[PDB]
Amino acid sequence: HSDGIFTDSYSRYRKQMAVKK
């Protein structure tokens, strides 16, 4: 099961968060 925050993209988008700071 997955849904954005729970999948791959988020895993790669999550970190991107801090990075974009």
Swiss-Prot record:
Changing residue 19 to G: Strongly reduced affinity for ADCYAP1R1. Changing residue 21 to E: Strongly reduced affinity for ADCYAP1R1. It comes from the Eukaryota. This is Pituitary adenylate cyclase-activating polypeptide 27. It comes from Homo sapiens (Human). The gene is ADCYAP1.
